[PDB]
Amino acid sequence: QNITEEFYQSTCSAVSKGYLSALRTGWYTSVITIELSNIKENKCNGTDAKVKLIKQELDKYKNAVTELQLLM
């Protein structure tokens, strides 16, 4: 225990001594980048013809990326 506390009756107040500082005075900026593991869709007749999962997944994703593109 490095942290203690003195109480000054003279001035109704308590102080908490014994901390060690670290004052932010600047910013460090690094540019991180991340690639997509893309999916090459293999075309063929599946179980249900109306269900194109591979596509509906990319569409979903391409969309999320579009919405963000529009914040800038």
Binding site: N2, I3, T4, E5, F7, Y8, Q9, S10, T11, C12, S13, A14, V15, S16, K17, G18, Y19, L20, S21, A22, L23, R24, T25, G26, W27, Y28, T29, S30, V31, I32, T33, I34, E35, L36, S37, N38, I39, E41, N42, C44, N45, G46, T47, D48, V51, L53, I54, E57, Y61, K62, A64, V65, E67, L68, Q69, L71, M72
Partner: protein
Amino acid sequence: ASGVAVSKVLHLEGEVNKIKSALLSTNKAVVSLSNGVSVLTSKVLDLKNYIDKQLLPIVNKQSCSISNIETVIEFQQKNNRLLEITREFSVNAGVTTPVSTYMLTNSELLSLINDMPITNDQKKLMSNNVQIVRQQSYSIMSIIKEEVLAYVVQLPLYGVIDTPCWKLHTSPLCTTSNICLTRTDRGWYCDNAGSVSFFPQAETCKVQSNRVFCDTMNSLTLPSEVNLCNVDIFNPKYDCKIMTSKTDVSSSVITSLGAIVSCYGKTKCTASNKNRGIIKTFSNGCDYVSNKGVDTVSVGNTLYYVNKQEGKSLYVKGEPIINFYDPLVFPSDEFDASISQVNEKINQSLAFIRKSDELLGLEV
């Protein structure tokens, strides 16, 4: 013209006619078998056509759906992290804080830290408090395309370190018509180059153990004389920031290692303890109580908690999930034995004919 001889001739008709009938039946026998085999043959053909036209195509559509599915599931696993980052930027409109572990992993954060333009003492400090560093950081989306995402991480740099800090609490004080005083400079205080830095919003300082992390951005710089305000308010060396009142007043402030109580006027206060109940009654004046011995303090009807109240444990159990995969096996060996028996029967069927031809004879 006749005799026994005429008998013998009728006799030769005798056997020969029977062996004629014998053979007629044997032919019909062979025509019956031909038909069986014609039918059986068509039923084998239709069996294959079932497998080729009906069954096989369904087994391929399934191979395809399983490929599709797997791919999709593997998309979400091999882009787990890219996909979390887009969710984060999507929810917060492109600027998050704190810096998540999707946005920046531990080995990366440490990577960046041992590259910042600071001393080994600072690099070492941040390395231990990765939590606080993540909460004082931002993550700002910068370039976003379909196949690649890019974003600036913005970590904090500490201009000074290892300086005495302290946190100041205050409560009212009162002549015993009476006047009251309350110091209005509550908050954190850290030593900066020969002066004191003073951080007055609680939001700007984080604290972890004996360690404090503040943001100089919205701080006030004071002379080291403000510390005489802790013992004397009318200290002639620094005019203390104070707030007066011409009427009695009483409350409680809960500090980190205890709690202050200001009990003036006709108000009744008392510090209690979770084992013995009320263990002290405060008279007119300023008292201070330690969180070691006191557990709650009670000004008038309002009740202050000097310590966190330990509560009820909750526990949510889980069960192992099991996967039942029961494979399909075929009786290959027995089967081959029956087909081996069928080839054996055909072999000896040709034997019996070769034997028969030999009596006619056709040598084979």
